[PDB]
Every structure is written in structure tokens, then in C-alpha cells.
């Protein structure tokens, strides 16, 4: 045949592949999402998120080393109450759990870029991401609360404030508070872009949230991409130091449309439904379980995410896969 | 003060920095250089190139097998020849040193990546790249060369022809000799924009050229962007595998607009003279070399480059700076 | 061979060459950068930048009209202190060396355009570019007293404000200061996309700055092409009169992507560790000095920018290479 | 007033006006057309074109050099025929006008870069660019013999072949007869864009074209820019070197259209009656002429143009005005 | 030949022509302006703008209706002061010339459109655009007073009004002054984008500036696209109505960028020098004078012109040449 051009040139070998291969994938791009349940003391599996475990609070900082001499760079900090009530109240409590892990977290390993997930849906006695009104979850009754957790985080130490509430006006409330209390330097990674999705069921389980009910008129229509894009761009004017995309494995081309949409830094959140798709089906034979992570991180990295939110990262870095 | 936007909030510690970092060098990125001598016993020291030496043929079986076992993936050849003549015709010889170069690599480590420099100024009498003619460097007389030069390297095992010589149709013209030559696998390198640079200077002395004179009436004049452009995508049009940006270091925003003007690959080269600049500043003491020569290719990266050719490779390698 | 399509045909000649370029370089396009020691008799040299000096203050009148004789249009000042202590406070004192370098380059030459680099690195005890903390370099405090700062180089006859300090917000507090105080048109030249490079080595030999430790706190990470964009375009938000890329010549890809960004003017400074690369590699006899620095300035020129800061500068006047 | 950003702060100086100017203007930017009467002993003033004469070919050598001398790069030949015909064949007469133009410039300056008018309203009896039909100027006629001009002027030197007929497919026909001729490396400077302009009459007068009638079956409509657009890129996918735009003076919209939609260079012609204009008034007192002329040719320039045809030129370079 | 593009096809006839024009001329598209001296009984001839005069302001109402009864839809005034002083300040009393110029207008023929041109150098003793002070002509003294004077021309009947004064901010102080009094309807049309051109010179004879010295430090550097467009850019964020570029037929490549970056209307305006140009030319016989006035006229709407300023603009209504 007469082909000048010959895309299979470049695929004839590994050593050729790995030269010419656009995306690269290290242990400098993964966030070690972590649950933590106070007043507990053994480790409780997860059935829905097979090889994921609560770990107690009395176990943590033996936990964070632990992922810290593995290579992982930064964690995100779920916590399960044994205290909720009406508001999601200790959440902004000067030691209640969300100030304990950061506390714990960051007195242990100073080093640990700490990550405070920031809202109500594990402290509520009703399960909703704030303050359920008559109306239905007030969105201004909850940008004051979770202005006032994100002080205390700060205050414990957090690096970085990760408001997943998805409240209108979200980023601005937590950056005006955290800088009239004096925390200028601490960071907003806001959930910026956040689905409605039906990937999240595993996350029920994991953290324990109340809900009975959904979350959509809060969080986004996943068919919404020019809301989306808009919803994004709205957090990086009001001063987000980092944006979100959530889900992330189904929603590739709404971070690729970010991406080309603004300079800041995007991570993308491979949420637990992403992870129980992948270890069941591997349980079951159906897939090889490293290849398809690997694939599917790859592929994140690929569409334009700097950080990746992933439940695997610590088993990849003890594994030596990624460094 | 009134700030909402703090961008220092991402480079507080190390750990932060490396995280929101947005380019990774490694070793996959890397192409070696080497200088083979035919006929010659000892390892000869290329004075305007500290640290590189001139390879002897009888040790290049060696070397090679070196360069493999630092985790080098690919290298660039380039012989001095004992042989030259008006035309170079030694560089189209079934058994002349540019095919003994590509065959002893490839024998010797089968999976290594070659690229044949290919060219005529180092075994031309008069040092041109190409046929001398009454009206200059004669452009059509010197593609009917390269072609026959680049079979005679795809015979011997090269993976890539790299044509170095800056003749208009020269990609075309390798291509159709390798294709009704029957080697339609054989990749094309091309050189694409190829400045005419007062930095390659230590490559005069490193490979031995007889020119007195320039090379201006081929080479592109370094001040022309929108020409530099226009060459690599000619290139494209005619078929070529990889495109090239030579020099790179004073011209990482060639990289970058062409980068933005094509989805080939590009690689870019750090020629001889930003070696010598590098190594005689450090050897004076004005400059750590190490971080110098890290930013440098890191810079070659950002730009866009996919690729980069540089002499510092192997001792990157072997020192474990990269992998 | 049938190619329609021939670059070379406008290569033939310096004639053709020359209507032809692209891009042309110009004493317009320069600015000389000056060391100034205040309390010295003899200029002292710069080992690690052959052939630059300091400038006893006492002399800095028949430097400048020296310099203005050559045909230079302006000069960016930097202090050599006797008076360094924990804040830098010399640096707003109204007749401390920052204000008495403008006042002489004016009074003797009133048409020179001075920029003065307005920092704290070189008037500190501890070294740093501003007020130290606990916490590190105090970004707030240090603004606080780049504004005195600015106050005092206006007042004394700077044409441009050159905050070098890379804290955020720099550029709205010198702005509100020179205003509050009445200079409304005194301009400012931000260094608005300065890396924490590796290639300012000399210039610690030549200022003289204490720092023991980096900047990397503050200067942004050379990887990093869309935050180097972004703290560019905040320094325009904020009124700066000129951008800055720093260092220039590893950054044209930067300095390229700024120049369709934006329509401000823009600035490139060639710094010290280049000026050694090339000042070193020509001792050394491994390059042609007149040359490389030539098509270094030239691409930067090419790259984009509309000024250039050259060590070189002076030289190249004297000498008639450029006019 | 409460103003942050200030234009005026860069325009308070010559000096400071000069730093910032965007667009330059040097010798490099003209080419210089000339008349030449055969067969005539005196200069001939025309009187339109006012400062402008009718060269006689005894005198041309004498010109040419007088031309060289004050640093012109190149010349555009323009003939005054005493040989006219039905089909302009002294055009492609091989030591017809048009070939010994361009034969004496080349003979006694071999480093002029010489461009040859390609046309023949200067040489048919009706004075149309050239075949005449029943049904208007034929363009298919008209192509061959374009072709065999072209032919006789590159044979006697020229270094660009510049066909001014408006002619569908003429860069085709062009390039085909040089090439198959073997004159490969003769360019196309094509007069890719040029419009059925009024402001040519004196041209009328210099150069003695025949024709009462118009040529608006074959030059563009003047409000057509889509249509300009097209008409260069036609020329680029033919394969000319250089396109241009025709007049220039009043349409700098165009240039600058042109400049952002190729990467070759564009010419830029300041026709007879720019020069005219400029001259009346400037005779009556009106306007200061050199100011208009660099205002003009600055224009030119800033719009996009590499190379700009000038009247101008040997003036402004004789009184050192440009160099 | 083998072409199956033929523009030509399109060029065949005058009727083929009128149907594929891309660009339309009519009296919608012309302001003419008008220059009135207080205090005299004769019309008094502009010799450097022939067929220009200065009409008596008895004689007004008179030639606005002509104006009007021609079909001009709007004018723009300019005064010739008898009563002229440091600060211009007849400019803001509120029955001075600028005040009355309008309100005879208006008064005679109520859907005349008026702009009046809005500046103090026609009433200043110095002849500047503004206050002069120790440091030049002063920006905010100036911008008071361009508020003063705009809401006297307001009162009195313009329709918009004309910044011509180039002083930074003015667009915005007009817009406050005339708000602040009650004209919130009263429009601003800024001469936005307004170079220091050479091409004024006539306009020094009609309008009697007293001026000794240059405008460079407020009017823009005729060679500046990228402050160009900026300058216009900075006006549609203060509010004005419509954008303008001055002078305009040497400054198409700047409507044409103007145009594609803003949807806001922009005029232009064919200023004084160009009008001489072409009757001078044409006087002398060089060109004919309404096919170059309609072609530039024309140039001036293909560039992207919603309005043009032309003194041609009376003639063309009166002999029904545009409609
Ligand atoms: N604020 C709630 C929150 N924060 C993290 C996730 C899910 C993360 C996962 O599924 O791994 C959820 C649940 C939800 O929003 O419905
Ligand atoms: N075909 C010549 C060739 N191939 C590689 C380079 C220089 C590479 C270097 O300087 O490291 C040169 C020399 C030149 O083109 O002038
Ligand atoms: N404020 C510091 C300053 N201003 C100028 C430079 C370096 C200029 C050069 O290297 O030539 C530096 C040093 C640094 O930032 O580390
Ligand atoms: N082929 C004709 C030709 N070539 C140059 C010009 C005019 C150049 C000028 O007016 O200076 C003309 C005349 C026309 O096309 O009508
Ligand atoms: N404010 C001055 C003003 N307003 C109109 C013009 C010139 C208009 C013309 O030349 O037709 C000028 C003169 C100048 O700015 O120098
Ligand atoms: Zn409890
Ligand atoms: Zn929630
Ligand atoms: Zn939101
Ligand atoms: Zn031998
Ligand atoms: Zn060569
Ligand atoms: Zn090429
Ligand atoms: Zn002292
Ligand atoms: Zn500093
Ligand atoms: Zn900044
Ligand atoms: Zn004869
Ligand atoms: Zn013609
Ligand atoms: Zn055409
Ligand atoms: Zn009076
Ligand atoms: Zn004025
Ligand atoms: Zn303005």
C-alpha cells in the first residue's frame, strides 16, 4: 500500500512506547482520601469498598506515618460522628472530629499536605450536606457554618479547606472567614464542579451518612456541561486555589473543557462507586485490577487533571508501582 | 492587606511544590548523543565539550551496552570519518561508519533506539552538508544522496533516519527512497527547523567538519518565527514521524508555537554550545551545575517538547538524578 | 526533484537574508543594569560576571554619563548596602542608597529613564526580600514597606518602580502608595513572572545579598507555565505599566504566551547566570562571544519582548554593534 | 481623579516614547521601483509623480549604482516601451526591455536583489495586462506568455519574477515555466492581492500604459476583503514567496488581515498616487512631507508588511533619514 | 490551463460587480464637521483645506439647514475662539461658543444629530488640549474641566458628546459629570484611539490652536497597534456609546482590530491632512477626485467603520452621489 504516514512506527516496541507516551502518572499526583471514626477501636472494613477500612481515631497517627513512609504527599479527612445533631454542630466544634484528624494528621507528620473535607452531610442528624428548613437545605444558614468549620480546621492545622456541600457562594463565605480570623495562607481546594451522581453509593456506607432523600437540588444535573464549566469558573472568582471535578472517571471531558477553560489547578475525585466498579469486577475475574487502575488514574491525568483524588493510592505506593 | 488571591499559598513547603508542579522530566524524555571515530584506539577528549569524548569504533560495542545499562533509551550517531570525499559518498556505503554505527548498536543491544544523523558535512573535503556545486550547496543533487544514505542506515538498523543537512524536500525524498527500498517502518526524524546558530561551535570541534565558511544559504536565519513554523509543518505535509526544534535553548518559544501548531511529536535539541556554556560557567564556579542543567531541560520540557537530545544524558542516568 | 515549495530561494544572500529577517534588535531595546556600592573608592569586580563591576557611589555620576554618552535610554539600579539590618529599613529612608542612586542618575542625566529594583534582599541582615517571620518571609509586611519604599525612589527621581520581591500583591500596594503620595505618574515595572531560578548565582556575588537558604517560598517554580501566566495577568489587574519574565533566555516560552495574553509591554531580563554562560564558554574559547550574545538578545526579542535587561548592554553601545 | 491605570505615563519623553514604540522601520524594509525609457538619451520628469523620472536605459547603470550606493537592497524594473505589439511580445523577447532591465541592474550591482515587473500593459497596443479577445483580456493567453516572460527576465537575472496582471493561476503558470526551464531557485514575488484602484493614475503617466478603458475584469473589486483574502491564500497554495497587497495605503486593514492568516511575507505596494498625495500637498504647503512619508511608511509596517514598494526610498536613504 | 478556481468570474460585468460587493457607502454612514468662528460676518477660506470654510456664526442656522436639507444626518462642531485663556474656560461657560454652536443647531433643526467636539485647544491662550502646569499639560485639572464643559454642551442640546482632548480617565469623568447633572441620555463619543498623528496639520490653520510645541505626551505613538486597541478598550469599560479611531486612512489595520475586539460601534475619521491630500492631488491633475474620495471613503467602511468623520461629506449629499 502507498501510506506515507504510519502512526504504527511509534508502537513497535516498549522502549518506543515509553518515549513517545504524552501522559505520565507518579505518586506527586495522588490524594489519599482517609475515614476516620472517633470513639472506636477496631478497624472497620467497608463491605461496598472492598480492601477500605474506618480507621479509629485512637489509631490514626500510627496510620498517617504509615502513609507518609509510603511516599503519599497529602490525605483528605472524612471523619464518621458519634455526635450529630440538627446543624452537623461539632463540625465546627474547636475540638470536635474535623479538627481532631487535621490535628492528629498534621501534629504526627508535619510534612502531610492535609486536605479537611468541609460540610454537615456526616454530622447531620437528617444527613443533608447543612441546615434543612422548611424551604428544604438552606443554602446562607449553611455558608455561615461552614465558614465557622473552616476556622477551626484551620486553626487545627488543615492545609487546605475542601467545602463538598455544594452551597451557592460556598468558596467566598469560607475565604472571608478564614481571613478576618487570621488564616490568609490556608487554602480553598473547592469542590467546584460536583454531580448529582450515582457514583457515590459506596460513600453511604463508608462514612455513614443519615440521608434518606437526595442531594439534587444542591448538586449539578451530571447532563449539565455548560453549567458545569460555569459552576468552576464562578469558585476561581471568588478565590478558589484549586478546582474540582466530581466524579471524576465518567466526567473526562468536562475536566478537559476546564482545563482549556483556566489556568488554575484542576483535581479530579475517582469516587468510591469508581473504586467497588473496579475491585468487584476484578474479584470476579472480569478485568486484571492494576492494569485497569493504572488505565483509569492514567486517563484522569490524561484529560488534564494536576491532582487525582484516589481511594488505590496507598496500595500503589506501598506496591512501589507508582513513586 | 486585602487580597483574596495568595498564589505563595502553593509554595509553602517542598511537598506542595511538587504536587501542583506541572512538568516531570525523566528519562523517557531523553536522547543521547555519541561521537564515533573509525579507526582510531583511544577515547579522544573534545576540549570545547568537557566531559565528552570522541568513541573509537573498536569501543563502541561497549558503550553502548554502558548507555543500555544506565537506562538510556535512545541515541543519536554521529561518526568522524577517515574517509571523506567531494560528495560523502562513504555515508551511502552498504559498510560505511554510518551503517557500522546503526549495525553495532542494534546488534548489540537490539531493543536500544537508534537515530542516524544524516547528513554529509562530516565526510564531505569541503564540510558542506551536501553537493558543492558553482551556485552553492546544490539542493536536489544532495536530497538524491540523503535518500541513498538513509537506506543504507535502515538496512543496518537504524529505527530512525534524521535528516540534519536542511535541504528543502528532504523528508519527501527520504521517505520514498525508504518506502520503494522496502523499509516502510523506518521512521523519519526530521530536523526540521534547523537554525543557522552561532551555538554549535563545539560540534566543529567534536565531529570533525572541514567548512570554512557558513551555512546560512540552508539554515534558517534564528531570527525568523513565523519561517520557523513554515518549515516544521512542511515537514508534516511531507510525512515526517517527529519534528525538531535545533537549537532548543534559546528557542523554547519555537517549541512552544509550534507545539500549539501540530499534534506530531516534537523533540528539541540542547545543542553542543549550551553544553559548553553550562560546563564552563560551573567549572568556574558561577553556577551549580546540576540545578542548571535540571532547569535547562526541564525549561525544554515546559516549552513543549516531547524529546530532547542532550550530551548530559548519560550522566544524568547513571548518577540516578533521573530515571 | 518537484517541490514548488523551496525556503532556501530566500537564503541566497545576506542581501535576501536581511529583507527578509524577522525580527531586529535595537539600542531601544535595552536596559542596563547597574551595581552601585555606596562607601567604596575602587570599582570592584565581579568574578563570577567577567567584566562587570561595582560602582562606588562617589562615581556613579560619570558612570551614568557614560552610559548616557553610548546611547543607552535607561539603567535599573542596584544597591551594594553598608547599612543592612533585620527590615532593610535603609532602603525607605529618604536619603538611604535606594533613593541616592536615583537622585545621582537623574540630577546628572535628567533624560535617562532610571528604574529602581525595589526589593529588601540586599539591605537585610538575614538576606531574604522582605520582613522575616516565624511563619517565613512575611508577605503583608513586606508590602507595607515596598510602598515606603517606592515612596522614597519616586521622590528621588525613578521613572520606574521595579518591585523584585515576588510577594503577592505587590503591584496594588505599590500603586495605592506612590498615589496616597502624589506620583501618580511614576510607573511601575513589575517583575511579574519571576522564577525561583537556579541562573541568579553571579548576582549573589555581585549585590552581595546574606541569604543563606532560597526563595522558594516565594519566587514561583520554573515548571510551572500556567501559574507563570496567571501572576503576570494579576500584575496587569492590579496596573502595572510593564510585565517581566525573569530569567529570560530558558523562559521564550513564557515570554511568547504572555505576548498573546496580553497588550501590555513587556520585559525580559537576561540575568547574571546567562551572562556567565556566556562570558565563560568565549574565555574558554567554545563559542564566538559577539555572536551568541547577539542571537541570545535576539531571541528574546523574537520571543516577544518589547525590553530587554542585558549586562551586555554598555558594550554593545560603546562598541557601535547595536545603535 | 481615582485612575490606576495611566497610558500617558509612557509617552512623557522622547526617550521613554522611543523604549516602547512598537514598529520599526529601517532600510531593509524598502524595495525601490524604477523607470526605464529604451532608446531615449534624456531623464524624462513625470509629472504627477512629482520628484519622479523616466530613467534612460544608457543612464541605468549609472542609476543602479548611484541606488546600491545609499544602501537600497532591492529594485522593482518598470519598462517604457518604443516596441509595443498586439500580444506585448518584446516581453518575452530574450534581450527584449524587460530582460536588459533586469540583465544591466544585475551585471553592475550582483548583490541587488532584483524584481521584475511581469506584465504587459507596458508593452501591447491597446495597453491591457495582456491577450485581448472578443471577450475581454483573455487569461489563459495571457498565462503562457506571463510564463514565457517570466523565463527571459529570470534567465537575464532577476531574482524575483513579480506578475502584475491579475491573472487567475499566474504564480501556477509562473513557477511551472521557471521550474521546467530550470530556474528552480528563482522567486515569486506575486502581486497576490491587488485591487482595481483609482489611486494609480500617475503610474498611467510614468510608465506610458496605452489603455482607454479599465481593468476591472481582472483587478478586485476594492470593498472586497473576503474576496482579497482569498486571492493571497490562492497564491500561497500555488507556491509564491511572497504575497502582496495593492495599493497599501488604504488598505491596511487588509495587510493586517493577510499577516494573521500565513506565515509567508507580505509586500505592501505605496502606489503613485500615495506619492502623488503626499507631494501636492506637501508642495502646497499643507503638510510637513518627511513627517507624512515616515507616518505612511510606519503604517505600513505596523499593519503587518515585511517589505514595503516605495517612491520614497532612494531619498529617504541618500539624506540618511532611514539606514 | 486547469483551473477550476477563477475569481474573474465574478468580475465580468458592472452588474456582477454591484451584486457581489461586499461593502456599501451611503449618507448614513457620514458625520460632517463644521468649523464656526464667533464674532465675524464673512466666511472665511481654509487655503491649506480647499473648498473648507470657517462659517460666521450669524451665518449658522443658515448652513445647518443647507447641511440638513442635503440629508446629513449629524455633524460634529468645532469653535474658533475670540475669547481665549489659560485655562479655556469659555469652553464651560454656559452660554460660551461650544454651547451656543449646539444650541443653534439644535434649535434649528431638532433631528440634527450634534457631537461636539469637546477639548480646550481652540480656547487656550497656550493652545494646549488641557491645563498647563511646572510638569506639562495636566491630566486631572483637565478632566474637571472636560466635565464642566461637557454638561454646558449637554444643556444646551448635543447629542454626544466628543473627547478630543487624549487626557487618561476622560471617558469617565464625562460619563460622572454629565450623570451627576441629569444627562444620564447624553452620550459619549470618545476619540478613543487618537494618534499623534502628522496628518492634523491643516486643521492648525482652521481651527486657530495657538499651539508652539507637539501633543506627544497625550496623544498615542502613531506606530502603537497593541495601545491602541488597549487605549479603545479602557474607554468601552468607562462607559462611552461609540469608539473611535484617529485619524483614520493611514489606521485601517487598526479599525479592522478594533472591530473584532469589541461589539461596541466604532467611528473613524478622515481628518484634515488626508482632505488636502487628495484636492491637492487632484488640483494638480494627478488623480481624479470623487473616485479616490468614495474609494477611501469605502476603505474606511470594508475596515470595520460603523461612522466616518469626512469634510467631503457636504458635497457628496449636495451632488447626490451618496444618498
Ligand atoms: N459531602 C459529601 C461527600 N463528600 C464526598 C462524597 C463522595 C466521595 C465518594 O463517593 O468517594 C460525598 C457524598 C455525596 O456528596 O453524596
Ligand atoms: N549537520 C550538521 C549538524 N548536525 C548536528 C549539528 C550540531 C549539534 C550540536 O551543536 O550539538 C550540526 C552542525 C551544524 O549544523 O552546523
Ligand atoms: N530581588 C532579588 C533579585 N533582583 C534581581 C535578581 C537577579 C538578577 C540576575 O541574576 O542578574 C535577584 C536575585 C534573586 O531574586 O534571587
Ligand atoms: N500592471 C500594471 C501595474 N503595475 C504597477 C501598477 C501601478 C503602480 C503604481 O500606481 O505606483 C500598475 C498599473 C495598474 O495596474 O493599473
Ligand atoms: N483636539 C484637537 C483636535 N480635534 C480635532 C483634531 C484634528 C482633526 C483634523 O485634522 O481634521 C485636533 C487636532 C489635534 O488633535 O492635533
Ligand atoms: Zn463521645
Ligand atoms: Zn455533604
Ligand atoms: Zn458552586
Ligand atoms: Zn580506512
Ligand atoms: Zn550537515
Ligand atoms: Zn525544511
Ligand atoms: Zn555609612
Ligand atoms: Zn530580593
Ligand atoms: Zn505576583
Ligand atoms: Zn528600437
Ligand atoms: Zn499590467
Ligand atoms: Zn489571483
Ligand atoms: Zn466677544
Ligand atoms: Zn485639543
Ligand atoms: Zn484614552
Redesign the interface.
Known amino acids: 500500500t502507498d501510506?506515507?504516514?504510519?502512526p504504527?512506527?511509534?508502537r513497535?516496541?516498549?522502549?518506543?512506547r515509553?518515549?513517545?507516551?504524552?501522559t505520565?502518572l507518579?505518586l506527586?499526583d495522588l490524594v489519599l482520601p482517609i475515614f476516620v471514626e472517633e470513639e472506636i477501636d477496631d478497624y472497620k472494613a467497608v463491605e461496598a469498598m472492598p480492601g477500605v477500612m474506618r480507621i479509629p481515631e485512637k489509631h490514626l497517627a500510627r496510620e498517617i506515618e504509615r502513609i507518609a513512609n509510603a511516599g503519599i504527599?497529602?490525605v483528605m479527612t472524612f471523619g464518621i460522628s458519634h455526635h450529630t445533631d440538627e446543624t452537623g454542630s461539632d463540625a465546627w466544634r474547636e475540638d470536635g472530629l474535623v479538627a481532631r484528624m487535621s490535628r492528629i494528621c498534621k501534629q504526627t507528620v508535619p510534612?502531610?499536605?492535609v486536605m479537611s473535607d468541609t460540610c454537615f452531610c456526616e454530622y447531620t442528624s437528617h444527613g443533608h450536606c447543612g441546615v434543612l428548613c422548611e424551604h428544604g437545605v438552606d443554602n446562607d444558614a449553611t455558608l455561615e457554618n461552614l465558614g465557622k468549620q473552616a476556622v477551626v480546621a484551620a486553626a487545627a492545622g488543615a492545609?487546605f479547606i475542601a467545602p463538598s456541600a455544594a452551597m451557592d457562594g460556598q468558596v467566598q463565605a469560607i475565604?472571608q472567614a478564614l481571613?478576618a480570623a487570621g488564616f490568609?495562607?490556608?487554602?480553598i481546594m473547592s469542590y467546584s464542579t460536583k454531580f448529582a451522581s450515582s457514583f457515590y453509593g459506596p460513600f453511604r456506607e463508608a462514612a455513614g451518612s443519615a440521608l434518606k432523600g437526595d442531594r439534587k437540588s444542591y448538586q449539578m444535573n451530571p447532563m449539565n456541561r455548560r453549567e458545569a464549566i460555569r459552576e468552576s469558573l464562578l469558585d476561581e472568582a471568588?478565590?478558589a486555589?484549586c478546582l474540582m471535578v466530581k466524579p471524576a472517571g465518567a466526567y473526562l471531558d468536562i475536566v478537559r473543557e476546564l482545563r482549556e477553560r483556566t489556568?488554575?489547578?484542576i483535581g479530579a475525585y475517582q469516587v468510591s462507586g469508581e473504586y467497588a466498579m473496579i475491585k468487584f469486577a476484578a474479584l470476579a475475574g472480569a478485568i486484571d485490577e492494576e492494569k485497569v487502575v493504572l488505565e483509569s488514574l492514567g486517563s484522569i491525568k490524561r484529560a488534564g487533571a494536576?491532582?487525582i483524588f484516589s481511594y488505590f493510592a496507598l496500595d500503589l505506593a506501598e506496591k512501589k508501582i507508582l513513586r
Open positions: 501510506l506515507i504516514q504510519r504504527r512506527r511509534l513497535k516496541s516498549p522502549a518506543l515509553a518515549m513517545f507516551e504524552e505520565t507518579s506527586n504527599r497529602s510534612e502531610m499536605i492545609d475565604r481571613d490568609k495562607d490556608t487554602a471568588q478565590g486555589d489556568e488554575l489547578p494536576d491532582l
